Design a protein around this ligand. Structure first.
Ligand SMILES: [Cl-]
Ligand SMILES: [Cl-]
Ligand SMILES: [Cl-]
Ligand SMILES: [Hg+2]
Ligand SMILES: [Hg+2]
Lengths: 114, 102, 120
């Protein structure tokens, strides 16, 4: 009498798991893009600071940022990398455990009538 | 009877809730990084325009407003999802008690 | 009499679906931002390379002071192809997740239907 609902609940759990797995894939691609851009923006900032210094040796608009800025940005994003890489590893683990629990639940649903 | 499957369903809901909490922390970090890059690219664009004008002597609006909108939206959603997650956790605790009664 | 629990579980599935739908909206906005930045950084890279080459040329010939743009010749094409692929993948995922969310919504309604009948 409740079997139908139970089956649909277990089914919905698979559906939600599928959604969050595919959301994790899209999040990973977004994280990749962010990393790729960070390296390219840092290169541009480095380039422009080098060109400003060369000009200075020679007017030419002083590269405004502070001396310390490259170090700071490097340290901040290294922290960012460590946090994001940990979260990606943890979510992968949690997703794997959810898949196992999904299988356990299906097994139990199948054992249900007999 | 169906108790064991039920236990397993309740547990998988906590597992799903845990994934989405972690995914929100990852998404917040990614949003931070987007913001940080947006500010740095804006700075670079401004610098290059300044330099161009100086050189020639011898866009920003639009972008700012569009990113203002983006910020409002992002910010709304971050708040909203945090509250939804906390509600989910509370309902999770209720479902665990009810299973308990079982 | 597992009813209250079952209603609690169906309600929590609703809450989880609501969370993942809002998380997708946040993800879509983040993707948008990533794309906007990619377009602008690519524009900057192109401008700087062009400027560097034009200045190198004029200093050689002066025909109506710059640090050479260091990247390899082929980098912009490689960048473009890599992000075209990124885009293709992001687009697949956005279509797929939207489809999975609609399926989830359908199954939530079927579950609610069944919950309303078993207790009645
Ligand atoms: Cl700098
Ligand atoms: Cl987009
Ligand atoms: Cl290049
Ligand atoms: Hg940490
Ligand atoms: Hg718990």
């Amino acid at each position: 009498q409740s079997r139908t609902l139970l089956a649909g609940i277990v089914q919905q759990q698979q559906q939600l798991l599928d959604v969050v797995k595919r959301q994790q894939e899209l999040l990973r691609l977004t994280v990749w893009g962010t990393k790729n851009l960070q390296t390219r923006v840092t290169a541009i900032e480095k380039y422009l600071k080098d060109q400003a210094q060369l000009n200075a040796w020679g007017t030419t608009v002083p590269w405004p940022n502070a001396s310390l800025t490259p170090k700071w940005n490097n340290e901040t994003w290294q922290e960012w990398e460590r946090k994001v890489d940990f979260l990606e590893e943890n979510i992968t683990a949690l997703l794997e455990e959810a898949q196992i629990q999904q299988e356990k639940n299906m097994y139990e649903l199948q054992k249900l009538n007999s």
